[PDB]
Design a protein around this ligand. Sequence first.
Ligand SMILES: Cc1ncc(COP(=O)(O)O)c(C=O)c1O
Ligand SMILES: Cc1ncc(COP(=O)(O)O)c(C=O)c1O
Lengths: 422, 424
Amino acid sequence: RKTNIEAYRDGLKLKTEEDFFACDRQYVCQNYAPVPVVISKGKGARVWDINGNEYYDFLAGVSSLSQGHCHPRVIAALCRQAERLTLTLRAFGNDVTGPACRFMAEMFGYDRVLLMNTGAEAGESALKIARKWAYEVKEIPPDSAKVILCNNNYWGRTITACSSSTTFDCYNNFGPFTPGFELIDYDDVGALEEALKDPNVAAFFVEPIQGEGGVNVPKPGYLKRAHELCRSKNVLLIVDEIQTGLCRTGRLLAADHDEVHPDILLLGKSLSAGVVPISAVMGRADVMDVLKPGTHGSTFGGNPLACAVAVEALTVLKDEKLADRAERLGAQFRDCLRRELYGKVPWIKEIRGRGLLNAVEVDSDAIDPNDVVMKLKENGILSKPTRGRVMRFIPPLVITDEEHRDATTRIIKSFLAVEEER
Amino acid sequence: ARKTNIEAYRDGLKLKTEEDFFACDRQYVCQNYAPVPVVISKGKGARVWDINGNEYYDFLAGVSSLSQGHCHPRVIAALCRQAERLTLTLRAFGNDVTGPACRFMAEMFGYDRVLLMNTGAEAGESALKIARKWAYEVKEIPPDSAKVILCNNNYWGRTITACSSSTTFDCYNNFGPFTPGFELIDYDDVGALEEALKDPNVAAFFVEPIQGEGGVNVPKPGYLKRAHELCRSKNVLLIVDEIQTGLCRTGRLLAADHDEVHPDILLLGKSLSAGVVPISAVMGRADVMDVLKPGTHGSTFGGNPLACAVAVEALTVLKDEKLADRAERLGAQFRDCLRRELYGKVPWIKEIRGRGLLNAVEVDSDAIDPNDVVMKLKENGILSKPTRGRVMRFIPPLVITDEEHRDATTRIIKSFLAVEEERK
Ligand SMILES: Cc1ncc(COP(=O)(O)O)c(C=O)c1O
Ligand SMILES: Cc1ncc(COP(=O)(O)O)c(C=O)c1O
């Protein structure tokens, strides 16, 4: 049986990529840039376009697809639960949400788990928790709570996220803005310490490696020291692991590189293996319990379908030893690129990353960075930069040794060819 | 059948009674919901079963997220077929589903452009961003001056900006400081709206056709029609939140259709996916929606192909099963019967109200404990969660059969009479 989207699409008689591009222009809100490919299918580290051409996916949902596209275990868990029960609301109990929260609480070492749907919602929820905790436990004056975050942070697209962004296109013309934020440079202990002098600070909200900001890896010991400074002042450390967590950087959490156990942890993206939107906020009881009944909610948060998917997605990370995989392959990737491209390619500014969260920043005054993106695609690598000039290499962690060797050589080949053509 | 992973996992926990699940929940789940009465394990159509095999009619239905019923076979089949092929690309890449699904929606609802988000709060956030950016760029109002009018007792979600525009104490208390830019007026009051619309800095009026969480507040006939005229007069966008009222619930495709109103910006959610996965939509004319240029808005999962395939199937069910007609017919019967068998007989009922299958019975909490009604309903096989304590809600799947609806209506009336007997 053809399902309705298949049948409706068939009737539209879309043959070429351009036909699909035209369909976007006409019917899809135009808040994304043009795209170079129309993907029809995904398996593991590979995707295929509508013409059957094969690519490696080196974006992977910006680390939402760590377990690969269409991981059979995760798709079986989705389908079996979907036949049984998908939604009760948290107004009613069910036989999945509590067990899934227990599973997560034990895996990550927290007392309480709040399940939301998107990463932005996890961030919003964490800010709300930190504010309410500041008022009720720290006893700071009404409406005075402040939250410190860093320049170039990214946590989503709500108005409060826009209000705390330093990125022009994220905030421009979307005000007036939510107050209560203090922005400081990333990777700067001094600036943090000075900001923490304000007793009305509730939290410091930080990424262990800035994602959208350009795969900005801080100096060794940054997060470790930040947590000490925060604790000195009774300020919560909220660590956004929505992009860096779940084995991507070679550890279960990127915070583990600094032996930091976040006061509040955010997860998202590969929590569901890219199958359905589910995010998490985790914290100790005496923080999370400020969210009393009626004070927060979500229709789909904690729905049993997403919970079943998430438990399976997390178990795959463990069973397939994906943190070890990411560590090993990522170190090989960076060594190969540094050996083969530094010196030879003068318009590479840096090769950086941890695990399989890697970037190559190029000098956009020396090269058109889009020429690198297009060359990569010609050689079978789909990759989307950030900030124009920061090339990103973020494959599924399940990429095989042989696929990763192939991909790495296609990657080298592409940078070298761009240099040759300069 | 062979055990599923999650079944085996929980089997390892030895959680067997409703009270073991209640304890599990108390210990590991963030405690932002009230205690629950029941542990549901299976849903099908208008029915659910608890872990002991007891059957109930679900009269909450996800607050109108399950209009197509639990586990609709077509929608599962669509989920599973698409899930085997592709679930997520990001909108950074194209795929062969998102554009077609947006065209499908654009044509069904009569809009130029469709923005797909994940939750109803995200749809609201997105619409407010669009309205503000449009007011700055097209209306040329002073920078940072954009205002949005909303109504007292509105509900649109739980983001900080939503909390900043709420009049409900537990929704906002101790979550500030708050996003500025909102003007709060009484619902169902055209004179208050007209006066608020005198301010040229207003970008939008954001309103529910029937207030949902605020208590199934049905406005006077012609409220929304008049509101639209007043907004147009002032070049103010009418943002209509159909997340709870839309998609056949009230006996029409959109609740706005009762007033022959085509929203300037439409919000959908909830039953857009038949309760299977979170997907929401913001739709609008080109000259409004096109302010959202590349890089100015985004979402990881928004527009993912899996959710798109599910939504197209869910929307088609509404049509094919003539669920607007079913809701209209059964809902009219429900209100007739309850009024006829409860008013007078039961002194502590204040009002029976609703449209289609979005119905409520507001009780006098000074004269009765509303929770006694909730518990009596469950004893009689009806799962129902009130809003604001005293507003009992009756929101079944629209696929409820004539026989199931008759049975349920008789159980509901029986429950209210029983509580009254006990009061006497
Ligand atoms: C670190 C981080 N936090 C939060 C978010 C927002 O997640 P979502 O797109 O699911 O709202 C993202 C998205 O890329 C992210 O990279
Ligand atoms: C009218 C209305 N709008 C928005 C929302 C928020 O949707 P969500 O819970 O998906 O964030 C709801 C939730 O019930 C609603 O009733």
